[PDB]
Amino acid sequence: RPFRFGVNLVPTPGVSSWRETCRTAEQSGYDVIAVPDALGVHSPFIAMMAAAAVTERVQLTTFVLNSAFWNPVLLARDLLTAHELTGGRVEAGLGTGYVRAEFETAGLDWGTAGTRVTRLADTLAALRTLAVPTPLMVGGNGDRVLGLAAEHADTVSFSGATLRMITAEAMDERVAFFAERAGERDSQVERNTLVQSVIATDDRAATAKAMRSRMPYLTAEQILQLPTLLIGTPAQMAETLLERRERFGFSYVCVQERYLAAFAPVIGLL
């Protein structure tokens, strides 16, 4: 599947640079602007509308909605609106939330991991029943969550962390688990991952060795294979993404805002 590149931008209250940042993302060659769903961050669909007003090509996605925050019928109303009023430029990533304090602040029941995943399941079923027109992305690494992606999603997003970084070998197993659950639908589901750090260096080996300090549970060789890290020159990173599309099927690759400019050269090469 052809590469699609995203940058995960944080629209921040009290900061006046949102539209400028979105323009920079598009001008730097990104295909997608992703926004989070968190307290103390701008509201996602409203921020996506502001981004759509100053960009022409990028898709806009949530990455990812906290399912505890949304009534499925009212979310379907939001998604239909966002789709129609942007000319079909909005995608909706959904998942579970991991910050209990946000549940507490909003007056929502934290419950159990089981009830949080059931809420995601119930929302996805309702959105599909209501035939929402936005493409749906499901993110996580849990067995039930990947099963829900396999059943419902247009795009599955594999987390490269639990932050504890997951090895390439663990990622092999998660992608295979998803693929088995997806069955005949596997080929219709785009695969995404988020790269946490884009580390430009002329000495990847020396860089990985020093990084064992921050990831003592890994060898340097494992660090150089972690799907959540890109290390080296732009040419080396481009080659690494080609290899990881072959290995994992990852064609939709996102990076964090801090690395927007660091990663842009890789887009130029790919």
Residue numbers in the entry: 25 to 186, 196 to 303
What do the paper's sentences say?
Central to this pathway is PepI, an F420H2-dependent oxidoreductase. PepI first catalyzes the formation of the central statine, then produces the C-terminal statine moiety. Among these, the homolog kvPepI from Kitasatospora viridis DSM44826, with 53.3% sequence identity to PepI, was more amenable to study. Through comprehensive structural and biochemical characterization of PepI/kvPepI, we confirmed that PepI/kvPepI sequentially reduces the middle β-ketone followed by the C-terminal β-ketone or methyl ketone.
